[PDB]
Symmetry: C2
Subunit: 535 residues, 2 copies
């Protein structure tokens, strides 16, 4: 019986994932995946998640992996369902999320010969996966200990990113056929561990000349890192005396706020030319000015510390790329009290924040961005789309140390922000504020279906500047209502404060739509930038 | 010096090259780094522009335009995941043959793998799915213009079917001084010409089968699947001329003279006449019916032939036989029929009885009924866009669609992921009034393409067969589309009366059970298996 064996074959694949940390599982309905689905429904170790848009399912997985820092499975049916995993897959491969995708395949008898829901799947994602397994047609003449060891190889040696696992099943898909095959794994069925542990660690080693470099004029730059990390970096820089430029994604507390303004002042840039070393911890910097400054700074040595692989410095400084847990790194390269060498930067920053304050009253996109610690859920988290309002938050707010932030800023796609925030919220269980533009809200409209189901209040701010028949000036009321969500389109700050009060009250998602122009935002920034640069 | 003014002319040329090969429609999205191709295509007045914000949707919209018009259609997108969202349309094309030309804009290669923003590895991304893949180098006036136009010409010229992926890096930035300009004039008077630079256009076709005059006297069965509307008729003639039975699929537009095949294929008196069949000729591919699929899996004719304009094996049962690549119209001309007496005695009896069996269940307000009575609602001189959904299994099993009335489908890999936005592509290409039916699931899946359906050159009705707790009333309202949810045949007729007057999309949601529709079919399968 082909369909009894094909079930043991799947159950064997699922049980192994379980031994590498996989708890969350994302499924969508489909008439061929059934095997792996069935198999995962029987396995009591998994949290189930679903969504009918497969693109959105990949993002929802990405959300979860993002916050939980654990690997996360996705199961899908054969055909175009699979291609749709491609965005989240690509993003993961750039930021580290362990997405394990199990793609059910037609068997290889049935490829390239006109069958339904049948396409060429192995290899499908080119080099985007960290690993790609392309499982063979199931047969009892390959031992279970081969199959689990292949899974084990991939998950075990996975430092970061996605793993495509194509899973063909015989056709058509109730008795004792896979049984002694499964039995040959013995008391492995009762164990915590993988069948074959292979988890080498990838890690840069200790910089032996740190004790020299830590006495020079360095500058610290903080990118995306864990919230604990922001805090750790915050002291480590303070302890050293080096200015810290910290990015919205950093969670450092931003002890020199508004760097996108103040890096424009020649008094500032000319204090930095004097820098000998630049340690940047994490990556994906947000600001135009910080990106530019970084492109142009000259230092004797450039360092980028981060647990991701590869070049991260798009201007290609002479310097080092150090692969490490940031927190571990800082313990390994510890700071020592030295009095700060920068004297103007700290004034400029203070002043540049006074200049942003002076401009808080007007009800547009910059002021919302400036006022945004006002609106964070207590014990909450922020998620941040890829849209001017996030450059604005970075330029103009000073977000709390240690307060969690998330984003899809690997490739900064705008195609999955609602689904991702869904995952992001479901993972941690926390109240969530998520900020996004109208195109992103329209791109991923039906993940509103998702944001119905959330374990704690989620507020989605949609900044809408919108942008046979006359065009097309779209809003988000009927959307919120299509999916039974609360909606508020506050006309001013009182209405915004009220709409928040309402929204923190129950565990559902509430849409708050702030309508603004295409220019006020960019402009207030340019004006502030010009003001700050003269002072 | 000016890099920008030349990256302009590099783009201008790629686009103009395309113009020489049938491309008129270009579908585009808002984008940071595809500015250059966007702009070259805007200053170029051979193109019809179409636009959409969800790149997955765009791919399907072009799949739409290309499917109907049969001419290649270009797509432009900015660098990053916008590009990945092209995968599904690209795949489908590869199976159905649409010519999607993907211009994907890309960070220049100094910027790849170094944590630059919105930068990913693009060459290679779509693996084996496109038919030609091109990785254009970093733009320089050191590579002459003739090369770039020729590289294009070769890729378009030699393309039988499916997508081409032209990845185009541009050096940053975007003086507009004259920097491109002599470089372009080395092309000389090509610029005013109407023909490619290089004409490389081999034709691909199987040769007249020299033994047809023998097999055509044999006891043949004709299966017809997706072909053109003219084709459906030439096939309906031919099959009648020979005396062979025609099993005619919802996508065949053959008139379906032996209607309800899905019902009667399940009756022994017909399985048995079909066993007597010594040759089978299947023209087109992607058969729909569950029975016709099985029947085809187990038939054991002396020979199985498939005629289609597309390469590859198409018989997923692997019969001894032949796979002939040809335009069907042409094929029929190169293998005409000789009038001959029908060998089929019992099959026409059972299909009349089939229909008449369906007809007595024509009353109840459900999906199976709505499938059955779909011709009442066909817009006159219109086109049918059918989704991938039980309800379209019902059209094919329980209805009989008029000969040569145009159907269209995404049935290469049958995803349910871009049906609305394919539907818009389909209305816009031909200008016709258009009916489209889909499931709730489909409609949610590609929900945001309601934005495209706002925009039609003629009325579009989107019937949405919803089978349960969301309803489409507010989606329709978001996009300022008319909406109905009829509760019976009088409410449904009223809905339609309106929807035909104007160049807009009217959404019509029919609510049903998860079960009626299949029960109705099971039950009708049985009653027919008993006469």
């Amino acid at each position: 019986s082909v369909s009894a064996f094909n079930r043991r074959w799947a159950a064997v694949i699922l049980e192994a994932l379980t031994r590498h940390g996989v708890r969350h599982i994302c499924i969508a309905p489909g008439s061929r995946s059934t095997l792996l689905t069935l198999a995962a429904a029987e396995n009591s170790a998994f949290i189930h998640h679903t969504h009918f848009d497969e693109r959105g399912l990949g993002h929802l997985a990405l959300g979860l992996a993002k916050v939980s820092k654990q690997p996360v499975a996705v199961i899908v049916t054969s055909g175009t369902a699979v291609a749709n995993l491609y965005p989240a897959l690509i993003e993961a491969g750039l930021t580290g999320e362990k997405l394990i995708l199990l793609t059910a395949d037609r068997p290889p008898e049935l490829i390239d010969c006109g069958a339904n829901q049948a396409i060429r799947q192995p290899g499908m994602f080119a080099s985007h996966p960290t690993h790609s397994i392309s499982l063979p047609r199931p047969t009892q003449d390959i031992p279970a200990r081969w199959l689990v060891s292949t899974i084990d190889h991939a998950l075990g040696t996975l430092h970061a990113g996605g793993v495509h696992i194509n899973c063909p099943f015989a056709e058509p898909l109730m008795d004792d056929t896979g049984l002694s095959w499964q039995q040959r794994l013995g008391d492995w069925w009762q164990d915590d561990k993988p069948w074959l542990r292979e988890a080498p660690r990838l890690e840069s080693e200790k910089q032996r000349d740190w004790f020299f470099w830590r006495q020079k004029r360095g500058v610290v730059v903080a990118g995306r890192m864990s919230a604990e990390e922001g805090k750790k970096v915050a002291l480590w820089a303070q302890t050293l005396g080096w200015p810290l430029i910290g990015d919205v994604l950093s969670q450092t507390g931003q002890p020199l706020p508004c760097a996108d303004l103040w890096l424009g002042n020649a008094k500032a840039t000319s204090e930095l030319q004097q820098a000998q070393i630049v340690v940047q911890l994490g990556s994906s910097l947000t600001g135009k000015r910080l990106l530019q400054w970084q492109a142009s700074c000259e230092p004797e040595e450039y360092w980028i510390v981060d647990d991701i692989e590869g070049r991260l410095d798009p201007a290609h400084h002479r310097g080092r790329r150090l692969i490490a847990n940031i927190a571990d790194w800082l313990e390994l390269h510890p700071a020592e009290k030295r009095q700060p060498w920068c004297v103007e930067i700290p004034r400029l920053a203070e002043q540049a924040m006074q200049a942003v304050i002076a401009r808080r009253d007007a009800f547009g996109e910059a002021q919302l961005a400036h006022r945004i610690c006002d609106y964070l859920p207590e014990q909450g988290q922020l998620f941040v789309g890829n849209s001017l309002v996030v450059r604005l938050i970075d330029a103009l707010s000073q977000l709390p140390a240690g307060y969690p932030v998330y984003s899809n800023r690997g490739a900064s796609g705008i195609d999955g922000l609602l689904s991702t925030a869904a995952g992001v919220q479901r993972a941690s269980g926390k109240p969530t504020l998520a900020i996004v533009g109208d195109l992103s809200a329209l791109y991923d409209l039906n993940a509103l279906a998702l944001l119905r189901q959330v374990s704690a209040p989620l507020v989605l701010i949609v900044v809408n500047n919108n942008g046979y028949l006359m065009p097309q000036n779209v809003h988000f009321e009927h959307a919120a209502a299509m999916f039974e969500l609360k909606y508020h389109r506050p006309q001013n700050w009182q209405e915004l404060e009220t709409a928040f009060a309402d929204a923190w009250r129950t565990p559902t998602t509430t849409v708050i739509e702030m309508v603004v122009n295409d220019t006020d935002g960019a402009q207030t920034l340019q004006q502030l930038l010009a003001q700050v640069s003269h002072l």
